[PDB]
Amino acid sequence: MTRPRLYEEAVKRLHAEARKAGVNLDKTFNASEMSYIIEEVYVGRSALPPHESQKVTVVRWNPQLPFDHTNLVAMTRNEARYHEDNVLAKNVDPSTVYGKDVIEVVHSFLRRLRMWEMLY
Incomplete structure (x- = not known):
């Protein structure tokens, strides 16, 4: 937990994304x-x-x-502003914006996130 400016900004970003999407978390x-x-x-x-x-932040993926x-x-x-404009604002599947190689790497992280969720 050595980059507190990033963690604060990421909370603000995700809450702003939810507000824009009309989502009550x-x-x-x-x-x-x-x-x-x-x-x-x-990592x-x-x-x-x-x-x-x-300048790492967190976005809603899909x-x-x-x-x-x-x-x-992450x-x-x-990258987050591009993601918000071209994936989230257009409500499209991420695989329409990112290539198969990129989707496979991101999917490996999302697998980790879902598998670790129990231990969190």
Whole structure:
């Protein structure tokens, strides 16, 4: 939990995404959870190749699935703004925006996130 500016911004981003989507979350996001997602699940880097490590935030991955605590991907703020504009705002499957190689790498992280959820 060494990058508190990122965890604070990620909470604000996810709550802003929920507000825009008209989504009333089962449970709110918090800084400790963002620390866990960014630093532990996504090993302190963007899920998107080439896994840039600076200005990491968290986004809702798939807008066609529930906005829950397993539908979350770490990426740079610049990658997040592209994701919000081209995936979330258009309510499209991420595989229409990202190539098969990128989807496979992200899916490996989402598998980790769902499998770890029990132990969290």
